[PDB]
């Protein structure tokens, strides 16, 4: 009776993902039966399906790496999860775009159920990525600056909020658009100090434009090409640019002068590798940290369009969009307002 | 009575460098009068004159940053240099392409005069750069591998020798040429384990071609563009590519997959900054290290064309060449064999 979004081959998700009926496994001693409640469509999910990603589950595969589920049944040896608990995947690759599944308890992390459901559904990827990038590369103190691009993305909005919660001052690059003023005010209300366009970023002058803030030692990039070079250019001598997303045909470009004379560092960050390298308990501590930020009103989930699993086609469609209408989240529960 | 190579404006060294007659300063309390013996033409010297470099001495300026000189006279307060001592600049910017000069003793580092003159003349830049890059980024142990490009360059040959002296195993990329076999044997006799072309490097297969050696954790780059990407591709997960030279129009290009999934690091190295950041004593210790490698027969100076200061025009000409005939060194002493 399980309904799932399964791809049999790599390609355009719009074309290769289909809604199939699977049957449930048996609940072994250390297994957990879950009912998925919600699961976002994230760039990494799209890349997995397209076949350009560092982790590519065996085909045919279930789409999605992130989501929150409710524990329904547990195996005879399990003492640390109970019916009713909320859980999220311990790492990528699990396949979250479905109604029900049976997972080893070690594959799951309990999340408090007092936070909003949509927050739990999106806690495990974007906020974790943001927090990790802010902590793991440069030691930042209150008053220090951070610059990033794609600032309106899931990670970008989480960086704004978490950076603000850390007392950091953000310069947030976005793409040029007609409703820039509205976007700017919105990001500022999440805590952004300044919001600038890629066009502004490219100006020679702009490097020393915001006189009343320190040069950033950390830059967060997911765009690449010339844009990534312009982000680099904004760094203080010895600073680091961390790349956490992008495209195959838009490599990161670093001028020889910036590497040599400005002693800049280029790094990557991959949350799945972090999770692989660390214990479930260490990931749980990160989750609890973020849960506290949520309860303290220091982190809130972005604007989301809830789409029933059945209408997944339109949800995929929307997340492909260059200027993404609004984040898409697949929901397996009926809400107070029906969505046809 | 001083003869010097002086540029009044930035441009093609072939065009903007001229041989002028200067007069000597007075020897103050902490000053030293030196007679230059030899000075190489290095890429950094060319970049200074072209006006694309991180350090650009005030114009009109004397060409050259490297050389060895003999101390002739010293100021009344100097107790640590004596007539007859060999000296080299403590850092870049000094102006070494001339017959005589007066320098603050703090601007100079004594070098033992038991090593060959041409070695002393070239010790301060290329071997230092090689050694520093091998030590300062990845902790390499005997048996570990290093990959580099422009392996036939001054730095490249020094890396081969110093890496060999450290018990490291080198993969040495060079440009495709008709006399590749000869070049390969030559680099192997300096200690290179393998010598491959840029063409070979670009082959997908070649990444796991040398079965009997470990993947390198360190890559040394001075080429940029696609070549730099192909060098990166050879690194072990978590490895570092250090860039120490290149051109403005050939930035380093790093694919998103390599940064993210392979967790590669890109860095720069600038010897002048190292020297600025460290004490003269720390630079002297590096020099003594390299002097020991020389006396131990573990480091030898590359093949050099000695050119009198007067014939500097042809020396500049030769060092511009894409495939540099052979390294050019300006000499201020007559040798056993006259050079018209
Ligand atoms: Cl952007
Ligand atoms: Cl602003
Ligand atoms: Cl680093
Ligand atoms: Cl993940
Ligand atoms: Cl090469
Ligand atoms: Cl070989
Ligand atoms: Cl130097």
Numbering used by the authors:
A (entry chain A), B (entry chain A): 42 to 381
What did the published study say regarding this structure?
Mitochondrial fatty acid synthesis (mtFAS) is essential for respiratory function. The last step of mtFAS is carried out by 2E-enoyl-ACP thioester reductases MECR and Etr1 in human and yeast, respectively. These enzymes are members of the medium-chain dehydrogenase / reductase (MDR) superfamily, catalyzing the NADPH-dependent reduction of 2E-enoyl thioesters into acyl thioesters. The structure of MECR shows a bent cavity of sufficient dimensions to accommodate acyl substrates with carbon chain lengths from C4 to C1619.
G165Q variant did not provide crystals under conditions previously used in MECR crystallization, so completely new crystallization parameters were screened. Both wild-type and the G165Q MECR formed hexagonal crystals at +4 °C in a condition where the main precipitation agents were PEG 6000 and NaCl and the pH was 4.5 as described in Material and Methods. Crystal structures were solved at 1.85 Å and 2.02 Å resolution, respectively, in the trigonal space group P3121. The asymmetric unit contains one MECR chain, but the enzyme forms a dimer via a crystallographic 2-fold axis. In the MECR structures presented here, the first N-terminal residues (residues A31-A41) are not defined by the electron density maps, but the C-terminus (till L374) including the six residue long His-tag sequence is seen well. Otherwise, the current and previous wild-type structures are very similar (RMSD 0.70 Å for 332 aligned residues). There are some small differences in certain loop regions such as 240-252. In the current structure this region has high B factors, but residues are still well defined by the electron density maps. In the wild-type MECR, the substrate binding cavity can accommodate fatty acyl substrate longer than C8.
